[PDB]
Enzyme design. Structure first.
Site, PDB file in Angstrom:
ATOM      1  N   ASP A  32       0.799  -1.237   0.129  1.00  0.00           N
ATOM      2  CA  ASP A  32       0.005   0.069   0.112  1.00  0.00           C
ATOM      3  C   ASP A  32       0.815   1.202   0.028  1.00  0.00           C
ATOM      4  O   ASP A  32       1.825   1.056  -0.622  1.00  0.00           O
ATOM      5  CB  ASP A  32      -1.125  -0.003   1.290  1.00  0.00           C
ATOM      6  CG  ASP A  32      -2.269   0.521   1.114  1.00  0.00           C
ATOM      7  OD1 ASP A  32      -2.367   1.950   0.863  1.00  0.00           O
ATOM      8  OD2 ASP A  32      -3.234  -0.051   1.040  1.00  0.00           O
ATOM      9  N   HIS A  62      -3.616   6.086   3.448  1.00  0.00           N
ATOM     10  CA  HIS A  62      -4.277   4.941   3.202  1.00  0.00           C
ATOM     11  C   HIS A  62      -3.780   3.676   3.829  1.00  0.00           C
ATOM     12  O   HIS A  62      -4.568   2.837   4.330  1.00  0.00           O
ATOM     13  CB  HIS A  62      -4.283   4.911   1.612  1.00  0.00           C
ATOM     14  CG  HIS A  62      -5.140   3.812   0.850  1.00  0.00           C
ATOM     15  ND1 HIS A  62      -4.741   2.576   0.553  1.00  0.00           N
ATOM     16  CD2 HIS A  62      -6.598   3.677   0.701  1.00  0.00           C
ATOM     17  CE1 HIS A  62      -5.861   1.810   0.235  1.00  0.00           C
ATOM     18  NE2 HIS A  62      -6.725   2.624   0.389  1.00  0.00           N
ATOM     19  N   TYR A 165      -7.801 -11.920 -10.820  1.00  0.00           N
ATOM     20  CA  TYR A 165      -6.941 -13.303 -11.092  1.00  0.00           C
ATOM     21  C   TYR A 165      -7.662 -14.318 -10.035  1.00  0.00           C
ATOM     22  O   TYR A 165      -7.766 -13.925  -8.950  1.00  0.00           O
ATOM     23  CB  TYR A 165      -5.485 -12.864 -10.629  1.00  0.00           C
ATOM     24  CG  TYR A 165      -5.203 -11.912 -12.013  1.00  0.00           C
ATOM     25  CD1 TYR A 165      -5.607 -12.163 -13.260  1.00  0.00           C
ATOM     26  CD2 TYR A 165      -4.456 -10.868 -11.828  1.00  0.00           C
ATOM     27  CE1 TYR A 165      -5.252 -11.302 -14.360  1.00  0.00           C
ATOM     28  CE2 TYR A 165      -4.048  -9.978 -12.841  1.00  0.00           C
ATOM     29  CZ  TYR A 165      -4.517 -10.117 -14.166  1.00  0.00           C
ATOM     30  OH  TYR A 165      -4.325  -9.623 -15.241  1.00  0.00           O
ATOM     31  N   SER A 215     -11.157  -0.892   0.003  1.00  0.00           N
ATOM     32  CA  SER A 215      -9.963  -0.824   0.647  1.00  0.00           C
ATOM     33  C   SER A 215      -9.821  -1.043   1.889  1.00  0.00           C
ATOM     34  O   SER A 215      -8.985  -1.685   2.504  1.00  0.00           O
ATOM     35  CB  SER A 215      -9.183   0.546   0.503  1.00  0.00           C
ATOM     36  OG  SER A 215      -8.798   0.646  -0.782  1.00  0.00           O
TER      37      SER A 215
HETATM   38 CA    CA Z   1      -9.816 -13.659  -7.621  1.00  0.00          CA
END
Ligand code: CA
Ligand code: CA
Length: 269
Positions: A32, A62, A165, A215
């Site tokens: 991050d 953040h 992914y 997030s």
């Molecule tokens: Ca995934």
């Protein structure tokens, strides 16, 4: 006095804490904007892959906020993380502006797979596919790191990359009513959801701030994976991912909520 953010209670982290599970011995990499030293955090190390930002101090806020949701200390100030004893590593892959390159994120992944991290929290994402990132997600995965990533904040019925992914566990955000936040991306590949609205956590300047986002949801699952790992030291990343899903609280459609709301009490029983 210490406050328990609503999301922490919602995922039922205190029930696991009450049984003696706090994430002790689990190494969690926060990919991050860095993590800033703060009275309510313990940072164990890290590295920076952001050109021009050599330190792992957070110039944005953040990464520090995300890190507080995973492991803000259990003491008498501030807030409380899902796994207050997990060992946090600051792997700065995002500049202070909040964005970073695929290269920086891929180098932070490789670092986490090389340096024995158990969980890598990626509270970041883009609409754009990247084969380089897929390769880094896969490599970290093959090295035993459970990669946990935010589904994105576009509101759309598909998931951002790298959460899209297969080897990245994709996390959506819920609100205080257990509804999918309107900004929370969903669709094919969503694994689970966690609190992502009005989440109070640590912020640079030895302060606290309330933010919204997939997030903020991500780190409640990264902290819950550290509780499970503490409990079942021999489980791999895949076993942990699958147990968090099998024990989540179903909220309806897996297309909207994945397996449901992460549940740290159920997952550590
Ligand atoms: Ca995934
Ligand atoms: Ca605290």
């Amino acid at each position: 006095a210490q406050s328990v953010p609503w999301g922490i209670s919602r995922v039922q982290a205190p029930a696991a804490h009450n049984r003696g599970l706090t994430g002790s011995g689990v190494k969690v990499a926060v990919l991050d904007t860095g993590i800033s030293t703060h009275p309510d955090l313990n940072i164990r190390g890290g590295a920076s892959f952001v050109p021009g930002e050599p330190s792992t101090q957070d110039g944005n806020g953040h990464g520090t906020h995300v890190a507080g949701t995973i492991a803000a200390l259990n003491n008498s100030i501030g807030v409380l993380g899902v796994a207050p004893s997990a060992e946090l590593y600051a792997v700065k892959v995002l500049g202070a502006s909040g964005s970073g390159s695929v290269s920086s994120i891929a180098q932070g992944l490789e670092w986490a797979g090389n340096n024995g991290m158990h969980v890598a929290n990626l509270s970041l994402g883009s609409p754009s596919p990247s084969a380089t990132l897929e390769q880094a997600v896969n490599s970290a995965t093959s090295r035993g790191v459970l990669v946990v990533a935010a589904s994105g904040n576009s509101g759309a019925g598909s998931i951002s990359y790298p959460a899209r992914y297969a080897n990245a566990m994709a996390v959506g955000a819920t609100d205080q009513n257990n509804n999918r936040a309107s900004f929370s991306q969903y669709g094919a590949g969503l694994d689970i959801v966690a609190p992502g609205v009005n989440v109070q956590s640590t912020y640079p300047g030895s302060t606290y701030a309330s933010l919204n986002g997939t997030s903020m949801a991500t780190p409640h699952v990264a902290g819950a994976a550290a509780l499970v790992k503490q409990k079942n030291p021999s489980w791999s990343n895949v076993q942990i991912r699958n147990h968090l899903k099998n024990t989540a609280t179903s909220l309806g459609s897996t297309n909207l909520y994945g397996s449901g709301l992460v549940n740290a009490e159920a997952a550590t029983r």
